Each structure stands twice: as structure tokens, then as C-alpha cells.
Design a binder for this molecule. Structure first.
Ligand code: ZN
Ligand code: ZN
Ligand code: ZN
Ligand code: ZN
Lengths: 73, 72
DNA sequence: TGGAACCCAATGTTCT
DNA sequence: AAGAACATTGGGTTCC
């Protein structure tokens, strides 16, 4: 299938969730770092393969929403 | 000293409009090179100092309609 | 599967 | 004013 956050081609199941590799490192980066991002829209940006980069705020919300956590295993 | 695009550090009329330096470069790059910018919202994103990075579609649109143009 | 370390794309600066 | 040229940040891929 495709990633459950961004719809790119998934690379397997990471931090609990079928994601592609990019969202994997992105989530890892967001959780261990700061993630104080601001949405420039209405906190419901569409996170597809190109737009992934537009809004880290919504991208991270979606990661959370889909269930990602560092302690999956 | 308020940029007509990202309402930031306004530094004189670039490409026909009072703009910051970062919006200066962005515009020439947007028109010159080819990328594809698509809005992830509603084609009305908030383009301010922190958030201008988030949506180049909307930033680019705000540029064009604030009068911006090269070979001015 | 999880993470390191490359590598790269875009932005924003300074300097001319 | 315009633009060459850095520097940097954030992102995404590669691990004969
Ligand atoms: Zn993804
Ligand atoms: Zn958003
Ligand atoms: Zn500006
Ligand atoms: Zn937008």
C-alpha cells in the first residue's frame, strides 16, 4: 500500500504505522526535536507527496492521528 | 518598512514592489525556474514571516497580485 | 523494523 | 535597485 499519512509508497510499518520512509524519519525528527510548527491554513492541510513539505504542523498531526509512537515495540 | 507580501523586513521596491530580501529572491526563482507549487489548503494561506515558507503557491500568488514583475 | 549518515532541495543571508 | 554567492534548515534516501 501507501503511507497512511502522506500516500507516497509505504516502505513497511514504522512506529506502529504503515508509512513511507520519509514520514518515518519526519515523525522521528518531530518527536525527538521541537515540532513547534504553525499551520498557514486551517489545520487541515492535504498531506500528499508534494504537499508533505508545505505543512509540517498538519503532517505531524496526521502522524499522531494515525497512531505513531516511538515505543511501538 | 512592512513588506507587501510577507509583511516583514521591507527593503525598497524589488521587481516593482516594496518587499523583503527573502521575497525578492523567491520571486525571481519562482518565475525563472520551474517548480510545481500546489496549495494544500484553500488557495488563501496566511503568508507572514514565519509561515511564508509553508506555501509557495500562495506566496507566489500574493507576489504576482501585489504588482511584482521582473524586467520591471 | 529503527537509526545513522549521506545527499539534496529550497530559503534567506550577505556581499558586489 | 538586481543578482552572484555564499550558508543553513529541513527533508528524504542509502546503507558493496
Ligand atoms: Zn508518507
Ligand atoms: Zn496545515
Ligand atoms: Zn516579504
Ligand atoms: Zn496555500
Amino acid at each position: 500500500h501507501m503511507c497512511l499519512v502522506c500516500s507516497d509508497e509505504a516502505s513497511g510499518c514504522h512506529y506502529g504505522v504503515l508509512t513511507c520512509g520519509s514520514c518515518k524519519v519526519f515523525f522521528k525528527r518531530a518527536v525527538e526535536g521541537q515540532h513547534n510548527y504553525l499551520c498557514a491554513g486551517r489545520n487541515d492541510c492535504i498531506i500528499d507527496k508534494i504537499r508533505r513539505k508545505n505543512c509540517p504542523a498538519c503532517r505531524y498531526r496526521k502522524c499522531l492521528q494515525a497512531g505513531m509512537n516511538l515505543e511501538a515495540r
